[PDB]
Design a protein around this ligand. Structure first.
Ligand SMILES: OC[C@H]1O[C@@H](O)[C@H](O)[C@@H](O)[C@@H]1O
Ligand SMILES: OC[C@H]1O[C@@H](O)[C@H](O)[C@@H](O)[C@@H]1O
Ligand SMILES: OC[C@H]1O[C@@H](O)[C@H](O)[C@@H](O)[C@@H]1O
Ligand SMILES: [Cl-]
Ligand SMILES: [Cl-]
Ligand SMILES: [Cl-]
Ligand SMILES: [Cl-]
Lengths: 551, 552, 553
C-alpha cells in the first residue's frame, strides 16, 4: 500500500545514459547492462524518459507513435527485457505520459491536417486567421502555425512539430485512455503525466495582455490551470489508472499548493503526487528563465517549505533538484570545483531529509556538472537554439545569451553520462550525439566507485537511511531560521522524535547562535553528515549535519 | 539576333541581398522589380537571378526543395511572372540557375528515396552500405557520406548534408529533370547557368581516392569531376530540351580542361553556349584549399586567363567574371579598397571587359562594394564558412588565422546587402537585414555613385556602351603581352584590320613601359577608354588602365 | 509657407492661345492680365506661363533668341511686370520655363559661335567635322546634325535645325545661364520648369546608335539623355542661383527613372523640388514612337502612375498632370468627349487630383476642351507635326494613317485658342486666329461653363478647394487597389488614422465592386466628393468617380 511513498526514483535520459552499439546514442540495451549498478546504488524506481517512436524534434517528447519503440533505442522485445530485468530485481518502471500534444508526424495529425472533413480534424485545435490569438510558443515564435492544405492554423504550445491535442473531444480522450491501457497491460509501474495542467484550454482563444517590452500575450489561465483538469484526471483514473497498481506523478507548472492538495488527496483519485516548478524559477529576474538573477536563499527555503506544509497532512510531494529540463544542481546552487564533492553531498542531504519521494537524475549521484561549450553549434536543444535566435534579434549580446545557456540550458543535463576516463567517458565507442563534458577525466562513475569519499557512497547511504529511518517518511516538516541567507535549517517531527537538518549553502563558515537549536542538537546524535569531526554549533563551508533526537 | 548572348552583358542578382521591399530583412522579387529601370539605365541586357526556388536555405537556395515553386519569402509565382515580363518589356532577358547535381533532402524525391530500399525513388540518389562508402570529403567539410537510420545506408553529398546528390545514371531521373526544365523554358526564361554540371558523372564503384600527406579525405579526381558521361548528358539535354528554345546556356565547370571546353562550346556540338570556369579564382591560395591564403602572383593570373581566351577564341565562348556570390569582392581581392578604390575598380573593369567573352557584373561591383570584416563568427552566415571554422578549429588552427581566411575568401563578403544610399541599412531594408550591412555604406552607395560623374557606375555604364558599339571587343582574337611582368597586365585584341592594346597596372606603383613593341603601338594608337585623365605616354600611374585602338 | 509648392495648384497658360487683347489673332500678356479675376475665382495659386521670351517662334517660344527680352507680339517688359505684380497682389505666383538645353540659332551666342572655329563662343555649342558626327535623328525629324558652310562643320540640334544645343561642358556657358536666371529671379518670379533638363549632359564622343529595322537614324540610348553630369549641374545651379530665392523648381525629364527621381527630388540633395515625367504619356503607343498608336490599357496606366506615387512618397515629390501644350487633351485622349464629356472630365480630374503631388491644370481642361480634327494638314501649325508628316509619308505611311496619328497625338490639339464664349472665334480674338478655333466652341466655352451649375468648371473649383482644406490629400501615402481591373482605377490615400478610397470608372460600362475589403471600408466612410448624384454604394455608373473619407479614432 502506497509503496511509492518510500521509493527513491532514478531518472534515465535514454539518449544520454549508455550507448551499447557504437552509434553515439544511448539505447535500451545500454540501460539493461547497468541494472546491477542501479540496484547497487539502491534506487527502486526507474523513471525512463521517452523511448517512443519520435522524429526527435524535442528528443522524444514529440511522439509519432505511442505504442512503438523508437528504432534507435531498440525494439519492443528489448523494452520487454528492460521491464522484466527491473521486476526481477524488485525494481519498478515509470514512463512519461505525453498527452498534451503529439508529433506533427503522428497519424492523428497527418490525418487531421488533410481536410476540414477528415474524421481526425477535431483531435487538434484548428482556427482561421481571424480566430487565432497572440500567444507565443514556449520554444519561441508564435503559438499558431498555418497549414496551406486547409488554410487554417493549428495550435502548438511547444514546437511547430508538437501540435496540441484537443481534450474537449471525448473521442481523443478515449483514444488516449486505450493507449495508456496498452502500456499498463504490459505491467509498467506508473506514469509521469507531462504538463498535465496544460490540457484544459479556453477554446475562445482570446488575446492576452502583452507585458511591457514583449511581443506575445500572457495566456493567464487560458491554457494553464484551466477549469477541466480535475474532471479529465478523474475520468482518466476511472477509465484507466484505477485498474492497475501504479504510481502517477502530475507535472504541473503553475499549479498552486491549494490545487496540489486537491490533485493529491487520495479520496479524489486524481494523481498520487505532484511535480512542481516553483523552486526551479527563483533564480530569474521575472518569469523568463533566461533573464538571470542569483538565488536568494530565503526565497528557496520559503518556497520549498510551503510545499512541505501544504501537502504533509494527506498530499505528497516529488522531491527533486534537477532533471533533463534543468541545469545540474551542483553547478546551479553548489560549488562545482573546490567544494564539488562536499556541496553535492550537502544538496543531497537538504533534499533527501524532506517529506516526499526523492528523484535522483542520472549523473547527480556522481556530481556531474553544467557544460560550457564555446559556440552555439555544440548545443542541440531546440529550446536553446530557438531562444538564441530570438534573444539575439531582441538585442542581447552573444556573451549574455551564452551566459543564459550556461546557467539554464537543458543540454547541461543531457551531455552523456560519464562512466569512466576512457574516450567519451566510456559512454560510446563512436561519436556521441552531444559532446561529453571534458571534465569526465575528473568526474566519472569509475572514479566515484573507487573513491570511498565520493558522492556515490553518500547517495547510497541516503537511500539506505530512507529504508531504516521511519521519521524521514512519517515526520511533519517545519522551517527554522527562515531569514538566514546562508543556512537552510529545518526539522522533521513526530510526537516523540525529531530530526534537525542543518545545511550551509555557502563557502563561508557559519556559527549558529539560535539557542533553541543549540539545546536540541546537544540531546541528539548525528544521523548523517558530510564533513568529519563536527564542531557542534558550527557549519563549515558547505557542511550538512542531521541530528536525531528521541523523547 | 543570331548568338545574341555573345554581346550581352550579364548582371547577377543575389536576391536575398539586393532589395527588401516589405521590411522583413531579406531581399525579394518586388524589390528587384523596383530597380528594373536602374538596371536598364546601367545598360545590362541579361539578369542572372540566383535561386528563388523553394528551398529551406541550407545553402541559400542552391538546396532546392521544389524546382517549380517560388520560395515564399521572395514572392509568389505571379510576382515572378511580373519580373520576367518586366524584363521582356525592356528588351532584357532572365537567366536562372539549373541546380541538378543535387536537391534538398526535403525535396519529395529524396523524402521518398530515403523511406526504403524498394521505394521507386531509391536510385534517384546514391545509397550505399557502410562497407561500400569511400573516403571522399564534402566540399562543405566532413565526410561526403551521411548515414540514414531509416534504412541503415549512407547517401552521397558532395555539398551539405542537406544536398544529396542526384543519380544521373538513372534515365527516369534525367527525364524528370528535362521535364522540369521545360516548365521554366515554356514560361519564357531566357537561359540557364548549369551549376557544377561537370560533377554529374560519378564512378558508381566509388573507390577510395589517394589521401595526400597531412589530410583526412581522398582526392576523387575523375571519379566525380569531369567524368566520362558529361558530353553524353549535355547532348541528351540539348536534344530533349534546350535546342527547342532561343536561350543561352552556360556550363559551370570547376576544373574543366580547355580540351573538353573546346568541345562543349563549339556550336556544331550542340552542348552549351559558353563555359564558366575557375582558373583565375583559386590562384591566391597555397594549393587547392582556398582557405590556405597566398598573395596573388600576377603572371599566374595572366597565364590562366589568357589560356582560356586562346583556347576558345576560334569557335568557343567564355563567361568573363571577377566575382559573384561565391567569391570575395574584386576591388578588395585584387585592387585597393581605400585610397585607390574608385581608380582600381575602374582598372579591374577595363581588364576584364576588353577580353573576348560575355561579361558578368555582380550586384554592387558597379559601385565598388568591398569585402566585409566582422569581429565574430556570430555575424557570419554561410554554411561553408561556419562548417570550415568548426573543422579547422578542431584540427588546431588558430582563431585569428581562420578569421583571416574568412575575411579574404568567405562567401559572405559577396552577400552583404546592396548599398543603395546613406539611410539606415543603406536603404536595403526598413527592418533588420538578414546579414549585416557593410559599415562603409555611408561612403559607398548607389546614390553617391549616381551623383558623382567620376564614379565607378558611369565607368561600367561606358564599358557596356563600348561593347555595343565597338565590334573588335566581340570579334577580336586575343594575345597576352608582357607575360612575366609582376605589375602590368597587358594584352592585345586583334582582327584582320585593327587592334586594341589594353594596359592595366595591378599595383599602387608607377610603371614605366620598356617594351619596344607596345611603345610602338601606343605611339600610333588613339585612346578608346582610360581611367586617369592626362595620360603620360608610355607610363601607367598607380592602378592606371588605358586602352589604345589601332585602325590606321 | 514652408514647402508651399506641395499644396499649390498650377494652371498652365500657353500665351499664344490664351487671350488676344489687341486683335492681331495671337494671344498676349495684357490678355492674361484681363483674366486674373477668373484665374483667382477658379482658385489656382501658381501660373506656369509657357515662353514669352523673344523668339522667332520656330518652336513657339522654346527657341529663344534673347532670354531677357519679351517677344514684342506678347507685350513689353512693363506689361510683363504688371502681370507678375498682378499675380502677387492676389497671392498668386508665376513660374516660367527655363529653356537651357538649346537656344535659337538667332541667339547672339550662336550668331557668334558659327562665325569661325576660333570664335570665343565656338564651344557654347557642339561643332564637329563630318567624320566626327553620328547617326542620331532630331526629335523633330531628319538628322540631328546640320552643316554650316561658313566653317564646314556640323552643329548638333536635338530639336529643330533652329534650336542648336548648348554645350554644358563649358563652364563659361554655365555661368552665363546662371546670370540669366538671376535676372529673372531678382524680378521676383516664383519658380522655373527646367525643360528637358536631363538632356544637358552629352556623351561627347557622340557614338553611333543602333538603327532599328526599317529606320535611318541610330537610337541615342543614354548618350544625350541621363548623362553623368546632370546631378552635378543641378547642384551647381542650385548653389549658385536657385537656393538664394524662395522659389519652386520642376525638372522635366523624359526617360529619368523613379530611382533617379528619388535622388533629384530628395531635399537633402538640393537639386529640384519635383519631377515632371512622361511614362504615363507614352503608354498608348505601340513602341517608343508616339505616332504609332495603340489604345491605352488601364492596368498599364494604373501601374505606372502608382510606381511614381510609391517611389517618391517618402522623400520626393511628383508633378501630377494629364495634359499640357505637348499632349492631346485628356477628355478626348482617355475620357469620352461626346455625351459623357462632362462626366468623364470630372472623373479624370478626381483621379489625378486625389493623388499625392502638385496638380497641373492645362488651360481649357477646366471647361473640358477637346482634341481638334482638321480635314487637311494645312490647318495644322506645329513644326513637329508638319515635319513628321513629311517623314512618315516618305517612309510609306498612308495619308489617312498619318492624319489619325495627328488627331490622336498632335500638339496642336492643345494649342487651338481657348474657348471663352460663343461669339466669333469663341471670343479669343476679333482678328484671324493664328491657329483655327475648335468648331465645338459653340457648345464648349467658358461662359457656358460658368452659367451651368453642373459644369466641369465648378467641379475643378471644388477639387482645388479640397486640396486647400483636406490635409490627407497632401500628407497621405498612396497604394493601388484592384490592380488588374480593366475598368476601375481604385486606390487609397492613408495616414496613421485616416484614409481616402478613390474609385474611378474609366469606362462607359457600369461596374459592381465585389471586393469585400473595399466594400467594408466605404461603408465606414463618408463621401468627400463625387460626380454623379444618387450613389448606389459599391456600384460605379459609366464614368462615375467617388471618393470616400474614413476617419479612425
Ligand atoms: O514536450 C514539452 C515538454 O514536456 C515536459 O513534460 C518535458 O519535461 C520537457 O522535456 C518537454 O520539452
Ligand atoms: O550548390 C552547391 C554550389 O553550387 C554552385 O553552382 C553555386 O554557385 C554555389 O553557390 C553553391 O554553393
Ligand atoms: O524645346 C523643345 C521642347 O522642350 C519642351 O520642354 C517643351 O515642353 C516642348 O514644347 C518643346 O518643343
Ligand atoms: Cl481526408
Ligand atoms: Cl519550433
Ligand atoms: Cl553540412
Ligand atoms: Cl527642323
Amino acid at each position: 500500500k502506497d509503496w511509492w511513498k518510500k521509493s527513491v526514483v532514478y531518472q534515465i535520459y535514454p539518449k544520454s545514459f549508455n550507448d551499447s552499439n557504437g552509434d553515439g546514442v544511448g539505447d535500451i540495451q545500454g540501460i539493461i547492462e547497468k541494472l546491477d549498478y542501479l540496484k547497487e546504488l539502491g534506487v527502486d524506481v526507474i523513471w525512463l524518459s521517452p523511448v517512443y517512436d519520435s522524429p526527435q524534434d524535442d528528443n522524444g517528447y514529440d511522439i509519432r507513435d505511442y505504442q512503438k519503440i523508437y528504432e534507435e533505442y531498440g525494439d519492443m522485445a528489448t523494452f520487454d527485457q528492460l521491464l522484466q530485468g527491473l521486476h526481477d530485481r524488485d525494481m519498478k518502471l515509470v514512463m512519461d505520459l505525453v498527452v498534451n500534444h503529439t508529433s506533427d508526424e503522428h497519424k492523428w495529425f497527418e490525418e487531421s491536417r488533410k481536410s476540414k472533413d477528415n474524421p481526425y480534424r477535431d483531435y487538434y485545435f484548428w482556427r482561421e486567421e481571424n480566430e487565432i490569438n497572440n500567444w507565443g510558443s514556449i520554444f519561441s515564435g508564435p503559438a499558431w502555425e498555418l497549414d496551406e492544405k486547409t488554410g487554417e492554423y493549428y495550435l502548438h504550445l511547444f514546437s511547430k512539430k508538437q501540435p496540441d491535442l484537443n481534450w474537449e473531444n471525448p473521442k481523443l480522450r478515449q483514444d488516449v485512455y486505450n493507449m495508456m491501457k496498452f502500456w499498463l497491460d504490459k505491467g509498467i509501474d506508473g506514469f509521469r503525466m507531462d504538463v498535465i495542467n496544460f490540457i484544459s484550454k479556453n477554446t475562445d482563444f482570446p488575446d492576452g495582455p502583452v507585458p511591457d517590452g514583449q511581443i506575445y500575450g500572457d495566456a493567464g489561465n487560458d491554457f494553464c490551470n484551466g477549469p477541466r483538469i480535475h474532471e479529465f484526471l478523474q475520468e482518466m483514473n476511472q477509465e484507466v489508472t484505477s485498474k492497475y497498481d501504479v504510481m502517477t506523478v502530475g507535472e504541473m507548472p503553475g499549479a498552486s499548493t491549494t490545487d496540489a492538495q486537491i490533485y493529491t488527496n487520495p479520496a479524489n483519485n486524481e494523481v498520487d503526487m505532484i511535480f512542481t516548478f516553483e523552486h526551479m524559477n527563483l533564480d530569474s529576474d521575472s518569469d523568463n528563465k533566461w533573464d538571470l538573477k542569483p538565488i536568494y536563499l530565503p526565497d528557496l527555503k520559503e518556497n520549498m517549505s510551503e510545499w512541505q506544509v501544504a501537502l504533509q497532512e494527506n498530499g505528497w510531494n516529488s522531491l527533486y533538484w534537477n532533471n533533463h529540463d534543468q541545469p545540474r544542481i551542483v553547478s546551479r546552487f553548489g560549488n562545482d570545483n573546490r567544494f564539488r564533492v562536499r556541496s553535492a553531498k550537502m544538496l543531497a542531504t537538504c533534499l533527501h531529509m524532506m517529506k516526499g519521494t526523492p528523484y535522483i537524475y542520472q549523473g547527480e549521484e556522481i556530481g556531474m556538472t553544467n557544460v560550457h561549450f564555446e559556440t552555439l553549434d555544440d548545443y542541440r536543444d531546440i529550446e536553446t537554439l530557438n531562444m538564441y535566435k530570438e534573444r539575439k534579434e531582441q538585442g542581447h549580446s552573444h556573451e549574455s545569451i551564452m551566459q543564459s545557456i550556461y546557467t539554464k540550458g537543458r543540454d547541461n543535463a543531457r551531455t552523456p553520462y560519464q562512466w569512466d576516463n576512457s574516450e567519451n567517458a566510456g559512454f560510446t565507442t563512436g561519436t556521441p550525439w552531444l559532446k561529453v563534458n571534458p571534465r569526465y577525466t575528473e568526474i566519472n562513475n569509475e572514479e566515484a566507485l573507487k573513491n570511498p569519499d565520493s558522492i556515490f557512497y553518500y547517495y547510497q547511504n541516503l537511500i539506505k537511511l530512507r529504508k531504516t529511518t521511519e521519521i524521514i517518511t512519517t515526520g511533519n516538516y517545519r522551517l527554522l531560521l527562515p531569514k538566514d541567507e546562508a543556512i537552510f535549517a529545518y526539522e522533521r517531527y513526530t510526537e516523540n522524535e525529531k530530526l534537525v537538518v542543518l545545511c550551509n549553502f555557502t563557502e563561508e563558515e557559519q556559527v549558529i547562535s539560535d539557542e533553541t537549536i543549540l539545546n536540541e542538537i546537544q540531546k541528539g546524535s548525528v544521523l548523517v553528515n558530510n564533513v568529519p569531526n563536527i564542531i557542534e554549533g558550527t557549519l563549515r563551508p558547505y557542511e550538512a549535519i542531521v541530528y536525531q533526537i528521541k523523547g
